[PDB]
Swiss-Prot record, chain A:
Widely expressed, with highest levels in heart and skeletal muscle and moderate levels in brain. This is Gamma-tubulin complex component 5. Belongs to the TUBGCP family. Component of the gamma-tubulin ring complex (gTuRC) consisting of TUBGCP2, TUBGCP3, TUBGCP4, TUBGCP5 and TUBGCP6 and gamma-tubulin TUBG1 or TUBG2. TUBGCP2, TUBGCP3, TUBGCP4, TUBGCP5 and TUBGCP6 assemble in a 5:5:2:1:1 stoichiometry; each is associated with a gamma-tubulin, thereby arranging 14 gamma-tubulins in a helical manner. Gamma-tubulin at the first position is blocked by TUBGCP3 at the last position, allowing 13 protafilaments to grow into a microtubule. Component of the gamma-tubulin ring complex (gTuRC) which mediates microtubule nucleation. The gTuRC regulates the minus-end nucleation of alpha-beta tubulin heterodimers that grow into microtubule protafilaments, a critical step in centrosome duplication and spindle formation. Coiled coil: none annotated. It is found in: Cytoplasm, Cytoskeleton, Microtubule organizing center, Centrosome. The gene is TUBGCP5.
Curated annotation (Swiss-Prot), chain B:
The chain holds residues 573 to 657 of 667 of the full protein. This is Gamma-tubulin complex component 4. Ubiquitously expressed. It is found in: Cytoplasm, Cytoskeleton, Microtubule organizing center, Centrosome. Belongs to the TUBGCP family. Component of the gamma-tubulin ring complex (gTuRC) which mediates microtubule nucleation. The gTuRC regulates the minus-end nucleation of alpha-beta tubulin heterodimers that grow into microtubule protafilaments, a critical step in centrosome duplication and spindle formation. Component of the gamma-tubulin ring complex (gTuRC) consisting of TUBGCP2, TUBGCP3, TUBGCP4, TUBGCP5 and TUBGCP6 and gamma-tubulin TUBG1 or TUBG2. TUBGCP2, TUBGCP3, TUBGCP4, TUBGCP5 and TUBGCP6 assemble in a 5:5:2:1:1 stoichiometry; each is associated with a gamma-tubulin, thereby arranging 14 gamma-tubulins in a helical manner. Gamma-tubulin at the first position is blocked by TUBGCP3 at the last position, allowing 13 protafilaments to grow into a microtubule.
Curated annotation (Swiss-Prot), chains C, D:
Phosphorylation at Ser-119 by BRSK1 regulates centrosome duplication, possibly by mediating relocation of gamma-tubulin and its associated proteins from the cytoplasm to the centrosome. This is Tubulin gamma-1 chain. Tubulin is the major constituent of microtubules, protein filaments consisting of alpha- and beta-tubulin heterodimers. Gamma-tubulin is a key component of the gamma-tubulin ring complex (gTuRC) which mediates microtubule nucleation. The gTuRC regulates the minus-end nucleation of alpha-beta tubulin heterodimers that grow into microtubule protafilaments, a critical step in centrosome duplication and spindle formation. GTP binds at residues 130-136. Belongs to the tubulin family. Gene3D superfamilies: Helix hairpin bin (1.10.287.600), Tubulin/FtsZ, C-terminal domain (3.30.1330.20), Tubulin/FtsZ, GTPase domain (3.40.50.1440). Pfam families: Tubulin (PF00091), Tubulin_C (PF03953). The modification Phosphoserine is found at residue 119. GO terms for molecular function: GTP binding; identical protein binding; microtubule nucleator activity; structural constituent of cytoskeleton. The keyword Nucleotide-binding applies.
Length: 60, 81, 420, 420
């Protein structure tokens, strides 16, 4: 389920997220999410699936 | 935050300064010429110091706990101080 | 503690009668004041409790030229009260002099009701600005209480008269009344005729019996502002705890109100907050900034949305307030009322100090100053002639409201660090 | 964002009623709008979501001379909506003047619905060309929105009137209506009566109740064009992302449609593509070449065949389009719909800009010019007489549609590198 949400909602919902960026702070992206480039993205990863999926995969 | 010494070590002065202030202002209903202004300036500079320190300590991390900081900082009075 | 209500004047006794009928229908009691078995509450603040649980209200009734007071007299709610306190022009000086001669026995009525109370919190009066019989008289009794008791509070709910300008001494009377309001009162809640006219013409299609629906809206407001008293809350169950945050300064103590449904015949905390941010949901009509805002909500709320909402309320900056210092909005919750149909579930009430009301004062100041330049609009009535032969109280009131408007316009500035 | 639907006229309110019954039966909801438990979806674009999940549609209903609007009024789907917006000849100038006098309160209805929305994407209107009451009125409200909001889109689904020629001012009315359509609208989707007549006479044997089956086909088209909105897709979930590729030029913004089954009571991607290449599966009737084509497919498709198919589609050259530049077909996939029997599994919908529709415009131009040469076919009705004493708006519309047909005929040319 968590992997499905990962590869679904990015790789839609992020359309609305990126349209505001056309019109920057590190805290504004957070409250938009919880509702030349390079963004900061982190979300809660639970431990029993944090050990089966490598850390370096998320960077790719 | 009884288990947390720095925020506690800040808050005790916050209670004590009002202990002094509430008793002091009731004495005169006119201008305080009994060294009221000297103590008042000491109190306000001390409160500025301790308030910035406790804001640093606070920034556990509950939505209400984080959410109270912005009520003060909707002014940038302590987003700069 | 306990709060004693006062009522005088035609509009004041009308809104008091509507308030008591509102709290009669709202709680589980009879129109003679017998408790209903099917109903728990505290009604000990605005009603004295009896042995058959007759909650006889703390309402002292003063009348002058009674026509509608007679209709109040023969009523099926005339068994709710009988404290035996009813005691008999359209000028400020007239009502002032009429209150002046009977100040002793009405003060006996005051002290009798004070002895009826064990403790005390405040006096509310039902009054209308420039109401004729109410005007001047209300300023006089305000002077009497302010002389008599510096230990208590006065809250005042009164409307601003605008009939879209035969009576031309009305700006003088309202000016003298508001002079006594700024200097002899501690907190003022003021409303407009025009904003209630807008909300009434929007929610409905009535034009002529507008007073009656205005009374309904006043009753809903006065119940809402008192709900944390009447339904047992746990904070600001004293009046002074409510008043303390909104007023830093003894002349700028005027409080404006709002209420979320215009028509009341889900909503989320975000929706009702942003609705309450509108001036069209506020019943009072450079950039102006609030000093402090207070909101009380009553309904079926979910407690986790509310922190989400004030996060995003910071984020959108949908309010613009910066007095000079760290005074922000205060949000609170009260009980959704039983014993009535709870439709339009979540409803909010809003209380702020905003500098924009000075402009409305300035409008009246612009009118009065114009009439003062012509000096033909006192009409030489004998009452104002006795009370001031030189008419210098009008100039004193002019300099006081000049100080008030200047305090307002400086209070807008982020250099209000001094003179606050 | 959110899209507000509009409906007016007899044919427009008929097709809107059919569209809402289509989306009622299509998604899992009640005819009063209660969600079914057995059903996930987004219905937030064309329906406002309630607390008992009452998806009340964004449909403003305007009526004039109501007969079928009364039948819409007493219905088991009259509990789905009640936005309280229903407000009361066969001429263009008549409907124009009738909309002109009530433009304020219908604009209040517009702004109320706009305040109902947080954000906005576009306005759709249900309208029929030369429909009588709809004609002229629809052009007027198109003028009102185009004056009011340059920030939004308008999509329009309207049919071309052909009754195989008592009403002789119909080419004038349709000409004036299409003049406002070219200059005050951004994208037009037009259909023919005759092509739907062909498909209906082929799939079935009905001749007299043809309107009803036309409504069914319009509902299937309007669901199909909206499926990537209502069922959550991930591209062109804004209207403008769909519209952007097909229209390079602000006068040639007319879009023609097709749909693969004629009768709907395997198919491969090759089969449905080449079927969709036919003009007999298209519901609108020198060599003409498309500017750009778009296809959306919905069904049980195998993803590897589709690249094989467009290889071979290049190879056979079964389409003939060359505007002047590199604008080709766009193929897309949407979800095969649950909550209904999925028979005729794979079905496609087709959206192009093709120059051939100009000929059909030219046919109407040939009729109108003939009547304009005789000048006996306005019948001297008083409405067109007030609105234009000199009847020069017809000549202005004639020169505009002359510019339009010339732009079409130049748009065929591979020298359209300039003036595009």
């Amino acid at each position: 389920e968590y992997l499905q949400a990962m590869r679904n909602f990015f790789l839609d919902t992020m359309y609305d997220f990126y349209t505001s960026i056309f019109d920057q702070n590190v805290s504004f992206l957070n409250v938009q999410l919880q509702e030349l480039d390079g963004l900061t993205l982190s979300y809660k990863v639970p431990w029993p699936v944090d050990i089966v999926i490598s850390l370096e995969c998320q960077k790719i | 935050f009884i288990l947390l010494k720095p925020v506690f070590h800040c808050l005790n002065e916050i209670l004590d300064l009002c202990h002094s202030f509430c008793s002091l202002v009731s004495q005169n209903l006119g201008p305080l010429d009994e060294r009221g202004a000297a103590q008042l300036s000491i109190l306000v500079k001390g409160f500025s110091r301790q308030s910035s320190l406790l804001f640093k300590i606070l920034s556990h991390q509950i939505n209400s706990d984080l959410a109270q900081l912005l009520l003060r900082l909707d002014y940038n009075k302590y987003y700069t101080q | 503690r306990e709060i004693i209500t006062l009522q005088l004047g035609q509009c004041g006794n009308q809104i008091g009668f509507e308030f008591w009928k509102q709290l009669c229908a709202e709680h589980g009691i009879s129109p003679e004041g017998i408790v209903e078995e099917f109903a728990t509450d505290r009604k000990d603040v605005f009603f004295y409790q009896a042995d058959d649980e007759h909650y006889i209200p703390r309402a002292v009734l003063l009348d002058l030229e009674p026509r509608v007071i007679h209709s109040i007299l023969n009523s099926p709610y005339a068994k709710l009260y009988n404290p035996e306190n009813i005691y008999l022009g359209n000028n400020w000086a007239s009502g002032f002099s009429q209150g002046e001669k009977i100040h002793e026995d009405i003060f006996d009525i005051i002290d009798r009701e004070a002895d009826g109370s064990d403790s005390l919190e405040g006096f509310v009066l039902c009054h209308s600005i420039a109401g004729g019989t109410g005007s001047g008289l209300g300023s006089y009794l305000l002077e009497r209480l302010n002389d008599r008791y510096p230990k208590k509070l006065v809250q005042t709910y009164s409307v601003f008269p605008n009939q879209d300008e035969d009576v031309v001494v009305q700006p003088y009377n309202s000016l003298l009344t508001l002079k006594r309001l700024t200097q002899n009162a501690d907190c003022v809640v003021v409303l407009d005729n025009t904003a209630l006219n807008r909300i009434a013409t929007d929610r409905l299609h009535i034009q002529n019996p507008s007073f009656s629906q205005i009374n309904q809206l006043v009753s809903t407001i006065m119940s809402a502002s008192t709900t944390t008293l009447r339904y047992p809350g746990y904070m600001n169950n004293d009046l002074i705890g409510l008043i303390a945050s909104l007023i830093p300064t003894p002349r700028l103590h005027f409080l404006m109100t709002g209420y979320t449904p215009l028509t009341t015949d889900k909503t989320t905390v975000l929706d009702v907050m942003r609705r309450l941010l509108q001036p069209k949901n506020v019943m009072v009509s450079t950039n102006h900034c609030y000093i402090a805002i207070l909101n009380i909500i009553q309904g079926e709320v979910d407690p986790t949305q509310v922190h989400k909402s004030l996060q995003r309320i910071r984020e959108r900056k949908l309010a613009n307030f910066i007095p000079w210092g760290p005074a922000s909005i205060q949000v609170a919750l009260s009980r959704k009322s039983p014993y009535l149909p709870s439709a339009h579930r979540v409803s909010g009430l809003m209380m702020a100090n905003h500098t924009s009301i000075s402009s409305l004062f300035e409008r009246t100041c612009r009118q009065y100053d114009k009439l003062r330049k012509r000096e033909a609009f006192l009409e030489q009535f004998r009452k104002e002639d006795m009370f001031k032969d030189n008419f210098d109280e009008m100039d004193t009131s002019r300099e006081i409201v000049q100080q008030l408007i200047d305090e307002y316009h400086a209070a807008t500035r982020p250099d209000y660090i001094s003179w606050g």
